Paper text:
[name] is a voltage-gated chloride channel that contributes to electrical excitability and ion homeostasis in many different tissues. Among the nine mammalian [name] homologs, [name] is uniquely activated by hyperpolarization, rather than depolarization, of the plasma membrane. The TM region of [name] displays a typical [name] family symmetric homodimeric structure, with each subunit containing an independent Cl− pathway. All eukaryotic CLCs contain a pair of ‘cystathionine β-synthase’ (CBS) domains in their intracellular C-terminal domain (CTD).
Author numbering:
A (entry chain B): 14 to 28, 88 to 224, 231 to 297, 303 to 408, 419 to 488, 490 to 566
B (entry chain A): 14 to 28, 88 to 224, 231 to 297, 303 to 408, 419 to 487, 491 to 566
Amino acid sequence: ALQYEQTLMYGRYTQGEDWIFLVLLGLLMALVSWVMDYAIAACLQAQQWMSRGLNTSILLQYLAWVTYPVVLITFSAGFTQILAPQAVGSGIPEMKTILRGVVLKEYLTLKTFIAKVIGLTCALGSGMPLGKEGPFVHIASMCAALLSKFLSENESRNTEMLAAACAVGVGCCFAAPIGGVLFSIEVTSTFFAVRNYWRGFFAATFSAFIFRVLAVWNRTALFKTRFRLDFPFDLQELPAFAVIGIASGFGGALFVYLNRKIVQVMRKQKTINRFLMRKRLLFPALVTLLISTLTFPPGFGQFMAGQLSQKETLVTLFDNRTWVRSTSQAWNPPRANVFLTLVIFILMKFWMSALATTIPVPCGAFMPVFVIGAAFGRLVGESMAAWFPDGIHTDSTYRIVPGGYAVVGAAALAGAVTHTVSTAVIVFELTGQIAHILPVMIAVILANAVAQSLQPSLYDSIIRIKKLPYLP
Amino acid sequence: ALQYEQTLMYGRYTQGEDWIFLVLLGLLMALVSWVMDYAIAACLQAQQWMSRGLNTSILLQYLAWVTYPVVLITFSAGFTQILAPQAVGSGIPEMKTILRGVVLKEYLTLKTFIAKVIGLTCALGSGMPLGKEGPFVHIASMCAALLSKFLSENESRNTEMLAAACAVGVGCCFAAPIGGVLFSIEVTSTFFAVRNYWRGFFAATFSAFIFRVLAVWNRTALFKTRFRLDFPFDLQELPAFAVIGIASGFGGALFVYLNRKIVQVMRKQKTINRFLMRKRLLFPALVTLLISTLTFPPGFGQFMAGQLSQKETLVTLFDNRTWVRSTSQAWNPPRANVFLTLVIFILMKFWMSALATTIPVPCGAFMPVFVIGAAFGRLVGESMAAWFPDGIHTTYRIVPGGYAVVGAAALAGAVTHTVSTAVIVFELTGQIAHILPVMIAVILANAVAQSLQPSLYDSIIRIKKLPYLP
Ligand SMILES: [Cl-]
Ligand SMILES: [Cl-]
């Protein structure tokens, strides 16, 4: 068996009843997922309230803007450090190792569950560039471990039990039942049984039903698009969706390389590392103060749409309107233009997300890279709509739709970081439409073919950083 | 290697180079699939040209109606026995056996390819209730085998090339690039590498690109629906979509049992089996004459929409209109109503498809059971829309064509033991608005069917005496 060792970032490792189980697994992870999302929304509304409540100086608005996220990230790192140090980072590298028959000593205990749920809520409620896909795979796996201990060779049934929980975790994260099952298979395994695809599809369907009940009866796609079904794209637009796929493959390989290079450079410093490992809370507080200072809207933040939340940013990039011809006018500052505001957002969010993904809190990385791909897809789509203002064809009614290039760019960059093709299925379930299926599949295959030639996936790069037993 | 043996019905058996390959495999199966769909549409247009001319009397109309399909099926059966007897039936049971490392003597040869392509074109050019999912899995596997011999660790590379070919064949059959990859994995394997799911998705994307070019050079979704995006179904309707799944579970198990029972009765009836074996073409001709006599429109065919083609039938069932308040007209003859015509269609097409899939021709079974499920779904949707005329909530109305999409996916899932018929139904219709109803019905249909019977493809492995593992 292996046991956890702390360092400043990720740390290291050292040294019938089945229907009942899958229905109760689907019920628990939907209730736990709904409670976490309610508490994250309440934290983001409190930042808006304390900001909106005052106008006396730009200095008081600045101190309110930077203090709130630094306090939430300091509490997240410190509370996680006291209860369960093994709860920092994403959960996918460890669950991939546990399903391979390796034992990690205290990874699925009740203290680790309490450290994940409280630590993830404070990390996401700050507004830092953080995701939740990996943390949800570990929280679902702890629901399964505790539920199978309650519902009292069984090691094979344990592996069978944890694999269905990994499928439920991703499905609850995106509200995407089929794409979540298929993505969990691509990231947690190398060969997978058709039986465990059926057990995953069964449990994800019951969670989708509990979300549909909670969403209407006691108060659907998360980012609903409204594109036309008649001629959404021309045959002559296909070369541009192929450029998005190739450029996403080079960008997704660069992201994984940058995230590893940030970890390797601080492990090599003598005095800096030996100081910060005594001053444990100083590194997460300094990174949060840097990022929060640059997103401050009255200063530099207006040139990168810094006033939008992670949800509002993605709701605007997918809109059914052409900008070159909480609202889409955040991309159009008085002293700038749409093209410059997209280019600055892409360059700033790229290094901010690679840095924030390394701090010692519970966090994932999928939505951070998905939103960078959506902005790059808008940059190409608005550029096409500025070059062809009366449409791409001479015949002459149907104009270009830049929001459909954003959907393609989101799926292509996330596929190149994770080394998955099932981001295509996730993007149809997130948007509630399947009209861009050929553009999406072309871009996703080009992004994977380019990225796998350059780098490992994000999750395989983390396994090598943590010194876990590696199957290449 | 196992050797093939003839019988009245199914027969028996007795004792960067990877990118260049996947591009050419995706191209060839798209070109072959296009040439076949063109030839089948030309055969179905010639039946209309005979019918529009021969209006002199009911007798000249009847003789035109039954002679055309009896000639095409008799030629399909006769041509297959002369050239390659092993080409009859599906293709999935046999590829599932070849992927487990068994050798079948001549199954991927050029004479088998010619017999499969010409024989399936003539079988589907008749109005018979036949499919092509299995035949296209065999034709795609013959494209991959003939590619692998044209452009050259000799073992296992071929087994991975045949795994990608199974995915391309199902993807070209439905024009459904993701759902065809996932369905081929469920029906041909128990464990599949993530690396071969990527190889299938790559080759299927290139076939979809070549179809998009061909649809602009000559002339998004095969059965494109047009339902509203705002409240297409209510929370109170989920119990009706669940009853579709449970009823499709028993109906999908009954289809597999009846198909086996017909084959076992003929094998045991030794007095008839010896006589028909001296005269092998008599069996497909008399089944085709029986089916065509009942589908003849001026007779009994009125009461089961017998004047529609298989494509027109599915386009009428999936439309955005409510019939109780061609798309209504063929289902609403002057002597009856739409409910009675849906019930007679379901009960007649059930035994006709179970019988027709046993005859000595290249044929599949997916579109035959998908069309029965679509009608059973329409019956529940039109009954809900008749019971709740102002809508179910105290004021959007019910969409009967959305229940047809659920029933089509659920019955085809229960016959094949698959869940990927959900992904296939979104790619065939070009909408994903019914995803929760579809998944509820498909999971309920699978849990009921797997408790009662094997899959259709596992049942054929047992009938043909092939190597089996439950
Ligand atoms: Cl996320
Ligand atoms: Cl078919």
